[PDB]
Write a protein that binds this ligand. Structure first.
Ligand SMILES: FC(F)(F)Cc1cc2c(N3CCN(c4nnc(C(F)(F)F)s4)CC3)ncnc2s1
Length: 465
C-alpha cells in the first residue's frame, strides 16, 4: 500500500467506503486487492456476523493492511517471476496457470461452493474459501499484485476466466464451471466459442479493463443475511458504488451491472436518478452496441421487472425478445442454467401470470393482455425462439413436460383473439420448423391438445391400444 491509499482510513461509514472507491478509480490502476478486502471485511460484519454492530463496522488501516499483507505474502512467496520471463510486457500461459494453481491449491479441501459471502479476497484469506468466479477474480487480483498489467477478467453470463498476452488476445480457464465437469484450467475457451454455446456467448463475452473489474466486485457484493433478510447497509453501499461507477462511465459496457442497478432502484429509488426502466433499456442498448445483441439476461432483467409490475404485455414482449437471442445459439453441455431459466419462464412464470390475467378478465378488466392479439403473438414468438434454439443443438430442449403448459397457455387466449394474428411465411413470422407446423392448430376455438403435443415434441407415434 502506498501512502496515498492509506489516508482515508479508518473507514467509518458507507460514504467513507464510497470515498475510497472514488479515490481508487481516480488512479491509473485501482487496487483490486485493497478494494476486495475492504468489501469483504464490511460484508462479513454486516451480513455474516452482525454481533455487536451499532452502525457500521469500522475498517481500521491496521486491520486492512494486515489482510493485504497476508495476500501479497502468499502470492509473492508462491510465484517466482524469474521462472516466467515476460516478453513484450506480456504474461505467458505458464505464468497464468501457476497463479491459478496457487489460488486453487490454497482452498479448503471440502466446502459447499454455492455458499453466500465466499466471493471476496476477505473470504479467501480468512476462510480459505472462494466461489467459482471468486477464484477467477482472485487470479486477476494476484496478477495485478505481481505487476502483470495484461491479465484481465473475462466474463460471460454464467462463467469467468482471464484474457492476457500479446494484444490481450489469449484466453485461459482459471476456475471450474458448474458441478461435476472436468477441470480445464490452463486451456483456451476456443472450443466453447466454436461450438456456439451460451456459456461462451459466441465470443461476445466481456473483456474487462481494471475499472470493469471493480464493477464486477461491486456487483458481487451480497447483502443477504438470510433467506428473509437483507442488510440495508450493504444494499445502500452496493447501490452507491454502482452509481459511482455509472457516473464515471464504467458500466457502459456492463449490461448485467446496469440490470443489477435497475433492480436496486426498483427496491429503493434514489431521488434524481433514472427510472429502473431507463436503466434496463440502457443494459439492452449496451448489449446491442458492444456485444452484438448476443446476451440473454438484458431482456430477462426487463421482463422480470414487467412481470413484478404485472405488466403482462411488456413482460411477454421482453421474454419473446429473450428467445430471439437464444435462437441463434446451440444448446450445449454446460448451458443448463439458461435452460432452467427458460423452463421456469415457460412452465411456471408465464402460466401464473396468465392465470391471474384470466381471473381479472372474468372480473371485467379492459385492455387485458388476453384480449390483445399482439400478446398472443409474443407468446408464440417466445416458443418459436426456443424451438429454433433446439435446431442443430447437440442436446434437445423440448419434451412432453413442456407441452401441457404450452396447451394451457395458448388456451388462455380465446379463439377470436388468436385468429387475429396473421402468421406469414398483427403479423408474425416463425423461424422454427416446429412452430411452422403448428400454425394450423393455433386458431381453433378448442385447441387440439394431442396434435400440439405431437408437434412440439416431434414424437412419432400415439398409444398402441
Ligand atoms: F462471473 C460469473 F461467472 F459469475 C458470471 C457473471 C454473472 C454476473 C452477474 N449476475 C448474473 C446474472 N444475474 C441475474 N439476475 N437476474 C437476472 C435476470 F434473469 F433477471 F435477467 S440475471 C445476477 C448477476 N452480474 C454481474 N456480473 C456477472 S459476471
Amino acid at each position: 500500500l502506498k501512502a496515498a491509499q492509506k489516508t482515508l482510513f479508518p473507514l467509518r461509514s458507507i460514504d467513507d467506503v464510497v470515498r475510497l472507491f472514488a479515490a481508487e478509480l481516480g488512479r491509473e490502476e485501482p487496487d483490486l486487492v485493497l478494494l476486495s478486502l475492504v468489501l469483504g471485511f464490511v460484508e462479513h460484519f454486516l451480513a455474516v456476523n452482525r454481533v455487536g454492530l451499532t452502525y457500521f463496522p469500522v475498517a481500521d488501516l491496521s486491520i486492512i493492511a494486515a489482510l493485504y499483507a497476508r495476500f501479497t505474502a502468499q502470492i509473492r512467496g508462491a510465484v517466482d517471476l524469474s521462472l516466467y520471463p515476460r516478453e513484450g510486457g506480456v504474461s505467458s500461459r505458464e505464468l497464468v496457470k501457476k497463479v491459478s494453481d496457487v489460488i486453487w491449491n490454497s482452498l479448503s479441501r471440502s466446502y459447499f461452493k454455492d455458499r453466500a459471502h465466499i466471493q471476496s479476497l476477505f473470504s479467501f484469506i480468512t476462510g480459505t474459501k472462494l466461489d467459482s468466479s471468486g477464484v477467477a477474480f482472485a487470479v486477476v487480483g494476484a496478477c495485478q499484485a505481481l505487476g502483470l498489467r495484461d491479465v484481465h477478467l473475462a466474463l460471460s453470463e454464467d462463467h469467468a476466466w482471464v484474457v492476457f498476452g500479446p494484444n490481450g488476445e489469449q484466453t485461459a480457464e482459471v476456475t471450474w464451471h458448474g458441478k461435476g465437469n472436468e477441470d480445464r484450467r490452463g486451456q483456451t475457451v476456443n472450443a466453447g466459442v466454436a461450438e456456439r454455446s451460451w456459456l461462451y456467448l459466441k465470443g461476445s463475452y466481456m473483456r474487462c479493463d481494471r475499472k470493469m473489474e471493480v464493477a464486477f466486485m461491486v456487483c458481487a457484493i451480497n447483502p443477504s443475511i438470510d433467506l428473509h433478510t437483507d442488510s440495508l447497509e450493504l444494499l445502500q453501499l452496493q447501490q452507491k458504488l454502482l452509481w459511482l461507477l455509472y457516473d464515471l462511465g464504467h458500466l457502459e459496457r456492463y449490461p448485467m451491472a446496469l440490470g443489477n442497478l435497475a433492480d436496486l432502484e426498483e427496491l429503493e429509488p434514489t431521488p434524481g436518478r433514472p427510472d429502473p426502466l431507463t436503466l434496463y433499456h440502457k443494459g439492452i442498448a449496451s448489449a446491442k452496441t458492444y456485444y452484438r445483441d448476443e446476451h440473454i439476461y438484458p431482456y430477462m432483467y426487463l421482463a422480470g421487472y414487467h412481470c413484478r409490475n404485472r405488466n403482462v404485455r411488456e413482460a411477454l414482449q421482453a421474454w419473446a425478445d429473450t428467445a430471439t437471442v437464444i435462437q441463434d445459439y446451440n444448446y450445449c453441455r454446460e448451458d443448463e442454467e439458461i435452460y432452467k431459466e427458460f423452463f421456469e419462464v415457460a412452465n411456471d412464470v408465464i402460466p401464473n401470470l396468465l392465470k391471474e390475467a384470466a381471473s381479472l378478465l372474468e372480473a371485467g378488466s379492459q385492455g387485458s393482455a388476453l384480449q390483445d392479439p399482439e400478446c398472443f403473438a409474443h407468446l408464440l414468438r417466445f416458443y418459436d425462439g426456443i424451438c429454433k434454439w433446439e435446431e442443430g443443438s447437440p442436446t434437445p430442449v423440448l419434451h412432453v413436460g413442456w407441452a401441457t403448459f404450452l396447451v394451457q397457455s395458448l388456451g388462455r387466449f380465446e379463439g377470436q383473439v388468436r385468429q387475429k394474428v396473421r402468421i406469414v411465411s398483427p403479423v408474425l413470422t416463425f423461424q422454427s420448423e416446429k412452430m411452422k407446423g403448428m400454425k394450423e392448430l393455433l386458431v381453433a376455438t378448442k385447441i387440439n391438445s394431442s396434435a400440439i403435443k405431437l408437434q412440439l415434441t416431434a414424437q412419432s407415434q400415439v398409444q398402441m391400444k
